[PDB]
Design an enzyme around this catalytic site. Sequence first.
Site, PDB file in Angstrom:
ATOM      1  N   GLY A  65     -14.618  -2.815   2.629  1.00 16.98           N
ATOM      2  CA  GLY A  65     -15.996  -2.999   2.123  1.00 16.98           C
ATOM      3  C   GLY A  65     -16.540  -1.792   1.007  1.00 16.98           C
ATOM      4  O   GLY A  65     -17.326  -1.828   0.560  1.00 16.98           O
ATOM      5  N   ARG A  74       0.924  -1.250   0.018  1.00 12.37           N
ATOM      6  CA  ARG A  74       0.017  -0.109   0.047  1.00 12.37           C
ATOM      7  C   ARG A  74       0.808   1.503  -0.052  1.00 12.37           C
ATOM      8  O   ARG A  74       0.545   2.327  -0.530  1.00 12.37           O
ATOM      9  CB  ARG A  74      -0.773   0.033   1.095  1.00 12.37           C
ATOM     10  CG  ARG A  74      -1.908  -1.143   1.191  1.00 12.37           C
ATOM     11  CD  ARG A  74      -2.806  -0.948   2.390  1.00 12.37           C
ATOM     12  NE  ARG A  74      -3.937  -2.126   2.316  1.00 12.37           N
ATOM     13  CZ  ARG A  74      -4.914  -2.456   2.871  1.00 12.37           C
ATOM     14  NH1 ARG A  74      -5.528  -0.932   3.490  1.00 12.37           N
ATOM     15  NH2 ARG A  74      -5.811  -3.334   3.202  1.00 12.37           N
ATOM     16  N   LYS A 112     -24.174 -15.266   4.723  1.00 16.04           N
ATOM     17  CA  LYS A 112     -25.438 -14.410   4.594  1.00 16.04           C
ATOM     18  C   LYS A 112     -25.788 -13.954   3.426  1.00 16.04           C
ATOM     19  O   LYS A 112     -25.058 -13.168   2.934  1.00 16.04           O
ATOM     20  CB  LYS A 112     -25.456 -13.731   5.878  1.00 16.04           C
ATOM     21  CG  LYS A 112     -25.204 -14.179   7.179  1.00 16.04           C
ATOM     22  CD  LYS A 112     -25.301 -13.526   8.219  1.00 16.04           C
ATOM     23  CE  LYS A 112     -25.069 -14.224   9.627  1.00 16.04           C
ATOM     24  NZ  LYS A 112     -25.616 -15.470  10.075  1.00 16.04           N
ATOM     25  N   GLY A 121     -12.662  -9.917   1.792  1.00 23.05           N
ATOM     26  CA  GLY A 121     -11.557 -10.166   2.652  1.00 23.05           C
ATOM     27  C   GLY A 121     -11.111 -11.665   2.171  1.00 23.05           C
ATOM     28  O   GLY A 121      -9.751 -11.844   1.960  1.00 23.05           O
TER      29      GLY A 121
END
Length: 390
Positions: free
Chosen positions: A371, A34, A194, A348
């Site tokens: 996210g 990064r 989910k 992830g």
Amino acid sequence: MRTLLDLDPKGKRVLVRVDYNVPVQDGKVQDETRILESLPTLRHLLAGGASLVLLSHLGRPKGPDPKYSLAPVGEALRAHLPEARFAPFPPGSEEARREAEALRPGEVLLLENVRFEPGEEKNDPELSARYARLGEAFVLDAFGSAHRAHASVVGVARLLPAYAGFLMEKEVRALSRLLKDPERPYAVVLGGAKVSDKIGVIESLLPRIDRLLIGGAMAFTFLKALGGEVGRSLVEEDRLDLAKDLLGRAEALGVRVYLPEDVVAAERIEAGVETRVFPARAIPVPYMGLDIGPKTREAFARALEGARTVFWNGPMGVFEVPPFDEGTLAVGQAIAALEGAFTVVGGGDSVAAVNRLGLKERFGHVSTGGGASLEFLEKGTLPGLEVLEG
Ligand code: NA
């Protein structure tokens, strides 16, 4: 969206929100990727005659937690940019302001973790006003932070002329190819435990795609709604109707859906536990499906043949517990092996899988670990992006 070259950096101190949220262990950065990726933006600004003040988050501490100090990151950065220095002062502090005002052209200053500031996550306007004293212009080069209205992302951007850095622009453009005029056939592979966590992205992408592959435990909610017997597999009973409705929408929009044929099951989630392979629609109690089976992996790979665009987000099973990570690794391997397809990976576990396949360079684009990417695909924009437009 205003991009980096729209800013004339000559003789200006520029505030840059970067993403240096890297893994740290024993006071040492474990992966500086990064940091390296932020260099082009910084080099451009420095070549343009500016001084730089850098802001970044590290982890998600609720305040000044020493475990999350950016000190180690400052060391790694200085190794690449000798003109960079780190100051252990929260960016809304008077010490930070003084350090910034003392900077001279060519100098780079990394301040302490923005999450140390109580008003950071609240997008405190006064804190943002203090951040605005750190520079004359603002450059947001952290796509992974753009999904939240935080003081160092949106707040300060409203007080200073704001621009997207090179990296931020690159990330937005890559994901935009999954929203505007994507090359077809366009396939989407979604995983996760989910279905509730994928409703937004599914409803957003359905009108734009050709094929939708569903894996992970969330598949059992779809399977049970369709009449299958999933044994003790994880199911969101309150989402059974919704799952069926999503399939109905796929049918209405001409999107071919793929669900598991077989699964690898066990009586409990335990590493190396004995297993059994069952049809996904006939898992006898007390067994629970913990990963997609060999036939499903094969079918999912075949379903991607001919695709020109592939977006993948989510695990195909219990990724962190071998051998239930095979389905996820297998999907990654299949995507890496494709020809003529622009592939994008997010999430992830899926990104983690790509990172240990030894095939990362094979993918078109591996999104920022977070996210923000999924939220951008669902909404078509992000708070941090809107402050760069207009
Ligand atoms: Na949308």
